[PDB]
Design an enzyme around this catalytic site. Structure first.
Site, PDB file in Angstrom:
ATOM      1  NE  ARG C  14      34.520  50.278  40.900  1.00  0.00           N
ATOM      2  CZ  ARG C  14      35.468  50.730  41.707  1.00  0.00           C
ATOM      3  NH1 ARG C  14      35.176  51.235  42.893  1.00  0.00           N
ATOM      4  NH2 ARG C  14      36.740  50.669  41.318  1.00  0.00           N
ATOM      5  CB  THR C 169      50.138  34.608  45.298  1.00  0.00           C
ATOM      6  OG1 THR C 169      49.610  34.745  43.973  1.00  0.00           O
ATOM      7  CG2 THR C 169      51.320  33.653  45.288  1.00  0.00           C
ATOM      8  CG  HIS C 190      42.345  50.874  40.525  1.00  0.00           C
ATOM      9  ND1 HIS C 190      41.195  51.337  41.128  1.00  0.00           N
ATOM     10  CD2 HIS C 190      43.369  51.544  41.106  1.00  0.00           C
ATOM     11  CE1 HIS C 190      41.509  52.250  42.030  1.00  0.00           C
ATOM     12  NE2 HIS C 190      42.823  52.392  42.038  1.00  0.00           N
ATOM     13  CG  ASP C 194      38.363  51.931  44.141  1.00  0.00           C
ATOM     14  OD1 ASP C 194      38.709  51.770  42.953  1.00  0.00           O
ATOM     15  OD2 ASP C 194      37.248  52.384  44.470  1.00  0.00           O
TER      16      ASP C 194
END
Ligand SMILES: [Co+2]
Lengths: 217, 217, 217
Positions: C14, C169, C190, C194
């Site tokens: 990543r 939430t 992000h 993803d």
């Protein structure tokens, strides 16, 4: 000039939470759908235009709790105003542009409605974003997007400021049979409005919409 | 290289509103649900894959109004492009990663579809975020989240920039009986797109989805 | 002290996407509605309070994928924790304020439930935002807004930081006949989550809600 009540931050039960979310610069938007079936049937029965009725309704809710009226004045002082006035969208169908104007809400709906009507006639079509100035400091923004409905709406305002007043956005009606729903987004600063106050806002909008005889008629 | 029309800011009716929301750094996301029942039945009848049909549709709407194509070029000049190309998501089921690639939309759907198909074969599975470079400046982002539906979606991009082009995100279909709905979020910069233009975008998406014989077939 | 696994950024697949969205400071909120009909019927049959069951459920999903547990520790080191604990809302009906407290989730639901119950008794009504300190570093925020439902919710946190952990939430239940839906917003960074991971989160919440015999009972 609207009375501004200066806040004694050191003697406010919210001091900790206020400073916490001020440093984090935390606002939140919460979007739902208000059932306006009763409200709409009543304004239609009276021959009132819906938008000013809704502006008046929102202003009543804003003026029902000081958490909706807390901000910094132009001298940078923290406080809350006794009442806010709506700064609301108007549209120029020709030039295809919008403006923001404000109209005081002093008492009953009819008094406001007549001033709304004359303000729209006077100030629409000007080519200026804010044709009615100065704008009072005790004002909140009420925008409408009548061309499309929505189930989510958020403003990303990355402007280096802690603006503490509520921001309201409404969308195009959604019809489901005999029911009419109004998309409504509330965007508030967590230094002064918690989830609780957001719920208070939406539930108050709904409760007043369902009891128009109490404030409209 | 796509033609870029430089904007004369001093002779633009939007000058005031443009500079206002540029200083406030104001974008907004608006999320709704498009009824894609007619569109989906038509692509199924033709044996077309849905995603490229949707990419083509969105691009047509983007290219229908200059408010959807206004930005700064790489030299910092404000203007609008004659047409934008989509920079859209592709997925590698193996490595479990996504990439963004772009495919020009020059004319008819079939021409685009064939290029989409070959671009996906060429550039998927690369391990690079952007395997097809350089990316043209006249590009807009179209992302898909096919694994879950949504009723609200917002990007918080706190990147010190005033990026002015539209950002589109679509979600997993929602089935309600014989109807199929597509979650769709539009995120635009208020310097160049008002609520009006957001409504124009969503209503155009819906109108074109319901008339596929006009642009797809 | 929870085990923290330091990430070797140069040897992470990543790396590119992580640094890309770190520089862009990009998070996104995605709001949907979970069908909690099966979950609610089961907690009612057992006489369990719903909120701690939901806290436990969310924590299980968080602890099912390292993308939900990646952040910077207090020394600024990037890594992921083996497990996170929930930092969840509690309410003081009197003072009309909320607090955030945390309760470890070590094993089975009943063990957690008993600790939740005693933590709420000990730490509610304190007048402090965080009455149970120190808060562990391996914690995620779970907020509830029980007074109103919503279809969109977004936090605008403009705080100069790249906080990488998920933010959850939940809203007031929505009843549709025999079905009960839970508004749920996931807000993730992000760099580490993803669209795929957001879908994994919501689909896992739904799948576990529909199989309470597997983790609750
Ligand atoms: Co934001």
């Amino acid at each position: 000039e609207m009375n501004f009540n200066k806040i004694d931050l050191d003697n406010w039960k919210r001091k900790e939470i206020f400073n916490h979310y001020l440093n984090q610069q935390t606002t939140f938007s919460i979007t739902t759908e208000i059932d306006i079936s009763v409200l709409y049937r009543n304004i239609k029965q009276e021959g009132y235009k819906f938008y000013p009725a809704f502006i008046f309704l929102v202003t009543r809710v804003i003026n029902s709790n000081t958490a909706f009226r807390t901000g910094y004045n132009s001298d940078g002082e923290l406080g809350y105003w006794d009442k806010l006035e709506p700064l609301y969208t108007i549209f120029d169908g020709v030039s295809k542009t919008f403006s923001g104007i404000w109209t005081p809400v002093k008492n009953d709906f009819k008094e406001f409605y007549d001033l709304y009507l004359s303000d729209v006639e006077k100030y629409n079509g000007s080519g200026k974003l804010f044709p009615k100035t100065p704008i009072p400091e005790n004002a909140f923004s009420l925008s409408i997007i009548p061309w499309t409905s929505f189930t989510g709406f958020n403003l990303n305002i990355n402007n280096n400021s802690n603006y503490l007043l509520p921001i309201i956005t409404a969308g195009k009606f959604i019809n489901k049979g005999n029911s009419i729903y109004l998309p409504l987004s509330l965007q508030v600063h967590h230094s002064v409005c918690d989830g609780y106050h957001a719920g208070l806002f939406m539930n108050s909008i709904q409760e007043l919409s369902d009891r128009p005889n109490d404030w409209l008629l």
